[PDB]
Amino acid sequence: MDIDPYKEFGATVELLSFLPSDFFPSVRDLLDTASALYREALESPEHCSPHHTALRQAILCWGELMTLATWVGVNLEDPASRDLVVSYVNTNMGLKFRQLLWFHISCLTFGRETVIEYLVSFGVWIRTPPAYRPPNAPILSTLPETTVVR
Amino acid sequence: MDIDPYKEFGATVELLSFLPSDFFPSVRDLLDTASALYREALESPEHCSPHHTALRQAILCWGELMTLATWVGVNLEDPASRDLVVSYVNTNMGLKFRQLLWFHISCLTFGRETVIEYLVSFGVWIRTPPAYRPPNAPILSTL
Amino acid sequence: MDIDPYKEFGATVELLSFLPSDFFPSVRDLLDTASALYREALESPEHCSPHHTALRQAILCWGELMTLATWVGVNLEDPASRDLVVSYVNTNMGLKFRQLLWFHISCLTFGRETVIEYLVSFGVWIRTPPAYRPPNAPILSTLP
Amino acid sequence: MDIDPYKEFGATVELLSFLPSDFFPSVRDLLDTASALYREALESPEHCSPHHTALRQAILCWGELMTLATWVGVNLEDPASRDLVVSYVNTNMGLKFRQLLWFHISCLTFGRETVIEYLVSFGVWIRTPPAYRPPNAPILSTLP
Amino acid sequence: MDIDPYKEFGATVELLSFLPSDFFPSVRDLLDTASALYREALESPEHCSPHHTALRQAILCWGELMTLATWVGVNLEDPASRDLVVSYVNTNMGLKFRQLLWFHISCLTFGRETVIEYLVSFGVWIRTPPAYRPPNAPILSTLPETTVVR
Amino acid sequence: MDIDPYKEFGATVELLSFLPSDFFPSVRDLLDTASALYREALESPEHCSPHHTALRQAILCWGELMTLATWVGVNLEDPASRDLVVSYVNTNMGLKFRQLLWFHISCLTFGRETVIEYLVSFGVWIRTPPAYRPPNAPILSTLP
């Protein structure tokens, strides 16, 4: 139905189409981050935020895909097909869900404004050739660059 | 986590276990309804409601599953393994998405109160022995 | 009795397992830190803080546990099965007591909010790819 | 450190030596009492009291000790040594834990004043030779 | 469904797990006590008290168990099974129902506060070894210890 | 007496055990620093501060120790034993004196607050495993 899951929030896929695959933590890492930060909010009987509602659906569908992968690994005697399907799932679908979970966890930790400005700047950066761009990518952090907590 | 997708919407999987799995309309029937009734709101750049949010996400993930099925049919050399994967996908995961779509569309269309009352009444009905079970199963209506 | 030793302090084992088990200093180092900084307050006849009470009980637990381990190693004569059992004490209980001690000492030294922010930030940091995170690992310091 | 787990309040491990070791209820009985009376508070996210904090920490320590001993007696294969180590555990740690649970559950149910007066009076009683020792020993009660 | 029939009232099974089986009168005695004290309240068309509602249900279920025992005694030719089932019923289920009826009759005669304090004290007593506890158990009574009514 | 040469201020020999012994500058470097910064005050007839007093006394003690060891190594005729005794001297007394000079010169140049915060932070640092230990260790400075 030609839906963009970020348009509802202020972004698009074209804005995140720049962020490489080497930028997004693993799905297990992102799910651990969520469990640690907003678990009592994702498991709560309140909508909390549109970002919280979106996070719950993404986690559910990833769980369904993981169940699919285990079921395949168990019920497919053909190891070639088994491997190909499981690896396709992990790589591609995990990339989609990594984009998604990162976007939501970030728009929750930081704000939509900050995340969108970071995306604009990261686009400026990753579009620029290496011979003309700074080597140190732009960075989004809760900590100062000195990373000393007091 | 043990997330429940209906707890924020005032329900639980125990409250939808009342309805059987052969009751939910097919995923294609649910998507036709969703289009016809809320296309310009799901394609909208607004949080018109958590139901709309969840419906967008469900539709995107079902689309991912359909892309998976096509990619399987295209790339899987073993026809029997390819057939087993597609049928499992459809049956099981389409069942989950049937309940997910049914719930959200029905809420948007009728009301959370109405949907919960309908679940309770359908439980009454399906638990009622047949000798005293009316043939006119409960049904959601505006008129 | 479904007890969490942190939820009265605003944390959770899911939040402390969010860091690597290789991050938490050794039990000896933490006991030395305590003996150095809060000995007069742990031996004091005053409650002081819910953290002092918890820290006082964690030190006694470790003492009883080490007593058990050394006594059973003395009695048992298996030099190989020692390295497994009286070092399984170390891995499991030692990791849980390393997290408990770090949490309490660090809270008493810096602040509860500071410690929790540190936990989340360090977890996100060690989970993030290097090229898109600050190079230096997050650390706690009293020095401005 | 030389931490006395009672001097934080108004007692000492030598003021509880007035009570023999045959006086202290079993850990099962005491944990049942706790589950009965202060479960909603021990499972609470609030510093309801230092007794609650110490009780949480003690219950967790006992959980860790039981885990260790069971896992060990399982892996190790001699039941004679099994009985030996379990007797050692029971005696040494179980007594030090019955004391602690009794003290905390009492100073919670009853007051510190009442508990200390009870300890003094029971010292008087159990010191007095049996010939001149009444049969109606003292006991903690919320009744006449 | 993990229900505790006394939690609704302020107690638990762990608090009554101390009271021995030699402490509770027979079920016939407790039912006679109820019939004599609150019959016109248990047979009335008003809830009266949560304790009254609980008493009515307990009496009903005990009646069903008694009916079961008679039916068994009448319709089981096997005297071994007959005896074993009937004795199991009496002992175990009667112990449960004795705990229950005692608790309710007491929280009605006396109050919840008094009953719970008595239970705490009786626990203190029955946990203490005999060599260190008074021999005369703590006692709950409508009468003074002198038992002289004036 | 059980005199701790630091508790007169706000420290203890166990709070300086946070710093390894390989961290402390050589006595030559430290005496040069003193000559550079506080010579006019150490040669002064005024109680400019307890740090100054302790520093005078420590420098004199070192003078006496050096006199003894040199005079001895001279009179005694074995260089192997010479090296042995000088190694013992260096280790045992030189470390206990590097600690003292460092502490006093720092609490003079910088403040007691800063020195103690530095000790705590360096304890944190040198405890943190190297994998998660930043390279930019803490250091005392009058600059950013």
Chain F residues in contact with C109 (beta carbon < 8 A)? 120
- Chains A, B in contact, 3 or more Cβ pairs below 8 Å: yes
Residue of chain A whose alpha carbon sits nearest to that of C11: A36
Contact C22, F129 (CB under 8 A): yes
Residue F115, token pair as written in the block? 């020195």
Resolution given for this structure, in angstroms: 2.8
What are the backbone angles phi and psi of residue B90, rounded to the nearest 5°? -50, -65
CA distance E22 to D4: 41
Spell out the residues 6+ positions from residue E99 whose beta carbon is closer than 8 angstroms to its own.
E16, E19, E24
Q: Is the dihedral of CA C103, C108, C112, C118 positive or negative?
A: negative
Residue C114 and residue A149: Cβ atoms within 8 Å? yes
Residue C139 pairs in a beta bridge with: A148
Instruction: For residue F128, give how far its alpha carbon lies from the nearest alpha carbon of chain C (Å).
Output: 6
Neighbours of A146 (CB within 10 A): 13
CA distance A88 to B65: 12
Residue F118 and residue C35: Cβ atoms within 8 Å? no
Contact A47, B8 (CB under 8 A): yes
CA distance D137 to D143: 15
Residue A57 has its nearest CB partner, among B58, B72, B84, at B58
Residue B3, token pair as written in the block? 């997330």
- Chains E, B in contact, 3 or more Cβ pairs below 8 Å: no
Return the residue in A7, A61, A75, A84 with the most chain B beta carbons within 10 A, the one to mutate for interface testing. A61
Please name the amino acid found at residue A2: D
Nearest to E37 by CA among E52, E27, E58: E52
Neighbours of A79 (CB within 10 A): 9
- Can you tell me whether residue C140 is helix, strand or coil? strand
- Can you tell me whether residue C68 is helix, strand or coil? helix
Q: Which parts of A56-140 are beta strand (E)?
A: none
What are the backbone angles phi and psi of residue C140, rounded to the nearest 5°? -100, 135
Task: Output the DSSP codes for D76-141.
Answer: S--HHHHHHHHHHHIIIIIHHHHHHHHHHHHHHHS-HHHHHHHHHHHHHHHHS-GGG--SS-----
- Chains C, A in contact, 3 or more Cβ pairs below 8 Å: yes
Chain F residues in contact with C30 (beta carbon < 8 A)? 127
Query: CA dist E111 to C8, C33, E34, E42, Å?
Result: 34, 54, 16, 18
Spell out the residues 6+ positions from residue F44 whose beta carbon is closer than 8 angstroms to its own.
F52
Please name the amino acid found at residue E117: E
What are the backbone angles phi and psi of residue C139, rounded to the nearest 5°? -145, 155
CA distance C41 to C34: 10
Contact C133, C122 (CB under 8 A): no
CA distance C56 to F69: 47
Residue with tokens 């405890």: F127
Nearest to A110 by CA among C126, C120, B56, C7: C120
Residue A2 and residue B43: Cβ atoms within 8 Å? yes
Residue B82, token pair as written in the block? 């390819």
Return the residue in B2, B3, B14 with the most chain A beta carbons within 10 A, the one to mutate for interface testing. B3
Spell out the residues 6+ positions from residue C38 whose beta carbon is closer than 8 angstroms to its own.
C52, C55, C105, C108
Contact B81, A76 (CB under 8 A): yes
Residue with tokens 């970030």: A106
* Helix H or strand E segment including C139: strand C139-140
Please name the amino acid found at residue F94: G
CA distance B127 to C82: 61
Contact E68, E89 (CB under 8 A): yes
Return the residue in D64, D75, D77 with the most chain C beta carbons within 10 A, the one to mutate for interface testing. D64
Chain C residues in contact with D89 (beta carbon < 8 A)? 68
Residue C141 and residue A150: Cβ atoms within 8 Å? yes
Alpha helices in chain E (DSSP H): 13-16, 27-42, 50-75, 79-88, 94-109, 112-127
- Can you tell me whether residue A149 is helix, strand or coil? strand
Angle between helix A50-75 and A94-109 (nearest 10): 150
For chain D, domain boundaries:
1-144
Among left, alpha and beta (phi > 0; psi -120 to 50; other), residue A10 is left
Instruction: For residue A128, give how far its alpha carbon lies from the nearest alpha carbon of chain B (Å).
Output: 30
CA distance B99 to B137: 18
CA distance C40 to C52: 11
Residue B63, token pair as written in the block? 């689309």
Residue E10, token pair as written in the block? 């302020």
Is beta strand A148-149 parallel, antiparallel or unpaired with respect to C139-140? parallel
- Can you tell me whether residue A148 is helix, strand or coil? strand
Given a contact as 3+ CB pairs under 8 Å, which chains touch A? B, C
Contact F138, F117 (CB under 8 A): no
Half-sphere exposure at residue A67, Cβ-oriented, CA atoms within 13 angstroms: 12
Among left, alpha and beta (phi > 0; psi -120 to 50; other), residue E49 is beta
End-to-end alpha carbon distance in chain E: 50
Residue C120 has its nearest CB partner, among A37, A39, A140, at A37
Nearest to A89 by CA among A57, A65, A124, A64: A65
CA distance B41 to B131: 45
Task: Output the DSSP codes for A87-106.
Answer: HHIIIIIHHHHHHHHHHHHH
